[PDB]
Amino acid sequence: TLPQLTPTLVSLLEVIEPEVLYAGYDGTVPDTTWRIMTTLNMLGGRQVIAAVKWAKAIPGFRNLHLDDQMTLLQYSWMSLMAFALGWRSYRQGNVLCFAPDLIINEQRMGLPYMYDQCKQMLFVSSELKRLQVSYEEYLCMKTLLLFSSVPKEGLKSQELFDEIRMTYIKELGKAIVKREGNSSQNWQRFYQLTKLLDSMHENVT
Amino acid sequence: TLPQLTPTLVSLLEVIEPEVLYAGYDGTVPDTTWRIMTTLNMLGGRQVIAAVKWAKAIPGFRNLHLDDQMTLLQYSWMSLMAFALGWRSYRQGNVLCFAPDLIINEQRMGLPYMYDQCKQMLFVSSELKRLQVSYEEYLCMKTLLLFSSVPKEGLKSQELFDEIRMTYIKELGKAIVKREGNSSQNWQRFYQLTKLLDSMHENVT
Numbered sequence: 435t436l437p438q439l440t441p442t443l444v445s446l447l448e449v450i451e452p453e454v455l456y457a458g459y460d461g462t463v464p465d466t467t468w469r470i471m472t473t474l475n476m477l478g479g480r481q482v483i484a485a486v487k488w489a490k491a492i493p494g495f496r497n498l499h500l501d502d503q504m505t506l507l508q509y510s511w512m513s514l515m516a517f518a519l520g521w522r523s524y525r526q527g528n529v530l531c532f533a534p535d536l537i538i539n540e541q542r543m544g545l546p547y548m549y550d551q552c553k554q555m556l557f558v559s560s561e562l563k564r565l566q567v568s569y570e571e572y573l574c575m576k577t578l579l580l581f582s583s584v585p586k587e588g589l590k591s592q593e594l595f596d597e598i599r600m601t602y603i604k605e606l607g608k609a610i611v612k613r614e615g616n617s618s619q620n621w622q623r624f625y626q627l628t629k630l631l632d633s634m635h636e637n638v639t
Numbered sequence: 640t641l642p643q644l645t646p647t648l649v650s651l652l653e654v655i656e657p658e659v660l661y662a663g664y665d666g667t668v669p670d671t672t673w674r675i676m677t678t679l680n681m682l683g684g685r686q687v688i689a690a691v692k693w694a695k696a697i698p699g700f701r702n703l704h705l706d707d708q709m710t711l712l713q714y715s716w717m718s719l720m721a722f723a724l725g726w727r728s729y730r731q732g733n734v735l736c737f738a739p740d741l742i743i744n745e746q747r748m749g750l751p752y753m754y755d756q757c758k759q760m761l762f763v764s765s766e767l768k769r770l771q772v773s774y775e776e777y778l779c780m781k782t783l784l785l786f787s788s789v790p791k792e793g794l795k796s797q798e799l800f801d802e803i804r805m806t807y808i809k810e811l812g813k814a815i816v817k818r819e820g821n822s823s824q825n826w827q828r829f830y831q832l833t834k835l836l837d838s839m840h841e842n843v844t
């Protein structure tokens with residue numbers, strides 16, 4: 435059984451949450467769309483590396499065939515980064531919190547080419563604010579984003595994948611129960627959190 | 640009078656067309672969304688620098704107040720790169736020809752996250768193909784895109800800007816006349832090409 439320091443699967447996902455990355459943005463000097471995009475691209479390059487590090491620490495992940503591990507990251511990596519982005523944003527508004535030293539507030543949103551590049555990602559934060567998602571709900575949902583990005587039958591370890599996925603769904607079930615207690619609305623909450631997860635995989639391919 | 644080598648203002652825009660930039664993309668090794676986006680961001684950084692050098696070579700541009708020069712590039716730089724992209728694509732099927740060594744054909748468009756990052760830019764090539772735009776119409780339109788990104792009333796050299804802009808509008812009229820000849824449909828083509836320019840400035844600010 436799980437040690438008392440980390441007695442639930444969700445508390446292991448809390449242990450592997452990476453430290454937030456800083457963008458390296460000046461902020462002493464004035465903003466330009468060019469400065470933001472150039473810094474943002476460097477930041478996204480490192481967040482991809484951090485997201486592969488995080489996925490490889492998820493309990494169960496390293497037990498999939500290495501082709502399955504690569505396939506899952508291939509089909510979910512940017513969706514995972516956008517989901518983390520929505521959460522950070524949510525926790526601070528109608529802002530995009532790319533990094534603590536790089537927040538796209540309403541003013542920066544009006545810099546040229548900035549809103550039209552950003553608009554889509556604002557969906558995520560508003561849905562998390564609309565559903566008042568908890569930290570534990572967020573950690574389960576994020577792991578499931580990684581595990582719901584490819585059909586079981588398009589993978590090599592179909593059976594093991596399916597079992598690990600079902601474990602993470604149940605852990606989400608328990609984050610729901612912990613937050614809002616047991617009720618008839620608990621299935622509704624489960625429907626609206628998993629539908630949210632279905633949106634994040636749209637427009638991947 | 641203009642020299643006989645370069646007897647028209649459009650033939651001066653021909654002279655300042657930069658040589659095409661190469662992405663530096665291998666293409667021996669297989670494609671991934673990560674490899675394309677990372678290489679594309681390198682290419683975009685250099686294309687911005689080549690777009691600033693091109694604008695500083697347009698007849699009239701260096702005669703504006705330096706604040707006016709900065710403002711015009713600030714409100715048009717990505718629209719210009721997208722417009723040049725549309726034209727390269729048009730000249731080369733519904734592909735996005737970022738560079739000769741980096742073309743997003745239908746296959747690469749299906750790579751994860753790729754179509755959704757690309758879809759908007761397909762508009763430009765479709766309109767240029769729909770209207771059968773000539774190289775000379777294109778060069779005039781591209782300069783006008785730079786000279787219509789800001790109202791003159793928010794500039795320091797209001798009168799000079801207006802005169803330079805009207806010169807390039809007349810140069811477009813003459814590119815229109817050169818191909819289609821004098822017709823009742825010359826004004827229709829002129830509306831079509833300038834409506835197209837109004838789109839390219841949408842979603843800037």
Ligand SMILES: CC#C[C@]1(O)CC[C@H]2[C@@H]3CCC4=CC(=O)CCC4=C3[C@@H](c3ccc(N(C)C)cc3)C[C@@]21C
Nearest residue numbers: 474475477478479482515516519532551552676677
């Ligand atoms: C503003 C803007 C924009 C975008 O071009 C669209 C979605 C962005 C993505 C979301 C997800 C995301 C979350 C972040 O917190 C910062 C970065 C980030 C991005 C950006 C990005 C830039 C470059 C890469 N490379 C090097 C792999 C990865 C991500 C910028 C993206 C693509």
Ligand SMILES: CC#C[C@]1(O)CC[C@H]2[C@@H]3CCC4=CC(=O)CCC4=C3[C@@H](c3ccc(N(C)C)cc3)C[C@@]21C
Nearest residue numbers: 471472679680682683684687720721724737756757
């Ligand atoms: C796929 C994709 C994508 C995008 O994120 C949306 C529009 C692209 C832009 C168009 C206009 C454009 C035209 C090209 O021919 C290649 C590059 C290019 C881009 C890309 C770009 C990336 C980084 C910068 N920086 C460093 C200044 C500039 C341009 C990628 C853009 C922004």
Ligand SMILES: [Cl-]
Nearest residue numbers: 466467545546
């Ligand atoms: Cl700017």
Ligand SMILES: [Cl-]
Nearest residue numbers: 591592593594
């Ligand atoms: Cl299996």
Ligand SMILES: [Cl-]
Nearest residue numbers: 508671672751
């Ligand atoms: Cl890929």
Ligand SMILES: [Cl-]
Nearest residue numbers: 796797798799
């Ligand atoms: Cl003046």
